[PDB]
């Protein structure tokens, strides 16, 4: 007996290659984006804009202390570089 699919089924099915190619390309792009996001931080870090004020303060405390508080606490008169290429302030005026 003939086990062919329905005529509408075949007519719609004459797109499967292009559909699969589009799906593969989209999956590749998405995986590349996910790998780029994950490899630097070993995870997918949540946006600070999606975190409350308390959460934002808790998240950046260590970074702020390491990048600003430490140099300010152990500053030396000769520590500042002779050029203007120093670290900019936390708030740009």
């Amino acid at each position: 007996v003939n086990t062919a699919y329905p005529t509408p089924l075949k007519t719609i099915l004459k797109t499967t290659p292009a559909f699969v190619v589009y799906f593969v390309f989209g999956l590749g792009f998405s995986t590349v984006i996910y790998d780029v996001v994950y490899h630097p931080k070993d995870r997918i870090e949540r946006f600070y804009f999606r975190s409350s004020k308390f959460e934002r303060l808790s998240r950046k405390r260590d970074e702020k202390l390491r990048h600003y508080f430490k140099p300010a606490i152990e500053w030396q008169p000769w520590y500042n570089t002779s050029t203007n290429n120093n670290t900019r302030p936390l708030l740009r005026y």
Binding site: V36, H39, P40, K41, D42, E45, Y48, F49, K53, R56, L57, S58, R59, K60, R61, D62, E63, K64, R66, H67, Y68, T87, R88, P89, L90, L91, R92, Y93
Partner: protein, 58 residues
């Protein structure tokens, strides 16, 4: 070097000490007045793509 009185006078800001207002060049507004990225420009440019720049919170 200008004198004890001069140093005391130049180190006083408010006659009434009830109010507390630490000196700040500007007040934050972005991210509900928060610093989203506390790092250098090149530091952020590297951290967004190159690993190791994020010390994590744990």
């Amino acid at each position: 070097v200008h004198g004890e009185e001069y140093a005391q006078k130049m180190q006083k800001r408010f006659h009434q000490t009830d109010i507390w207002a630490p000196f700040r060049h500007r007040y934050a507004y972005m991210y509900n007045s928060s610093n989203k990225n506390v790092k250098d420009y090149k530091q952020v440019t590297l951290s967004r793509y190159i690993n190791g720049f994020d010390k994590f919170n744990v």
